Amino acid sequence: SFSGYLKLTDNVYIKNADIVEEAKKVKPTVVVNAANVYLKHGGGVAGALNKATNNAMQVESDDYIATNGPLKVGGSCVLSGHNLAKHCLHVVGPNVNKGEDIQLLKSAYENFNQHEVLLAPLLSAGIFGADPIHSLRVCVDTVRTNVYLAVFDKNLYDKLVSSFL
Numbered sequence: 118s119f120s121g122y123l124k125l126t127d128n129v130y131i132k133n134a135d136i137v138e139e140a141k142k143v144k145p146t147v148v149v150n151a152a153n154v155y156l157k158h159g160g161g162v163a164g165a166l167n168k169a170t171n172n173a174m175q176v177e178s179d180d181y182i183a184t185n186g187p188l189k190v191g192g193s194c195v196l197s198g199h200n201l202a203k204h205c206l207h208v209v210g211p212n213v214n215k216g217e218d219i220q221l222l223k224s225a226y227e228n229f230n231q232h233e234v235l236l237a238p239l240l241s242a243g244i245f246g247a248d249p250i251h252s253l254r255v256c257v258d259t260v261r262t263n264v265y266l267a268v269f270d271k272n273l274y275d276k277l278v279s280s281f282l
C-alpha cells in the first residue's frame with residue numbers, strides 16, 4: 118500500500134514523490150489526474166500520467182469528450198487507470214493562468230469525497246498557476262476521504278510541510 122507519507126490530518130497524507138512513479142509502484146484504486154475540461158493531457162501531471170499509459174489515457178479521453186463534451190471547471194469524470202490504477206479520477210481545478218475562478222478549487226476537491234482513498238496531486242498547482250499552499254489548505258478543509266498527496270518538487274514539499282497550519 119502507501120508508504121513514506123507524512124500524516125497532515127486524520128485523512129490527508131503527503132509525500133515528496135513523482136505521482137507517475139508512485140502510481141506505477143502502488144497501483145492504487147484511484148489516481149487523480151490534474152485534468153483540463155478537454156481532457157487534453159499535454160503537460161504537467163496529465164501529460165506525465167498519459168505518457169505512462171502509452172497514450173491510452175488520451176485515446177480513452179478523446180472518446181469520452183466526443184461522447185459527453187467537455188467537463189466543467191471544478192468537475193470530474195472517472196475513466197480507466199490503465200497500467201497505473203484501477204480508475205483515474207480526472208479532476209479539473211481552475212487554471213488561474215486562464216482567469217478561472219480560484220473558488221472552484223473547493224468544488225474540484227469535493228469530487229475526491231466520492232472515493233474512499235485516492236493518490237492525488239495538489240489541484241490547480243504547478244502549471245495551473247494557483248498557490249500550492251492554498252491548494253493544500255483547501256484540500257485539508259474539503260476532502261474527508263483518505264487522500265495521499267504526491268508533491269514532485271522537494272522545495273515545495275518542504276515549504277508545504279514546514280508552513281502547515
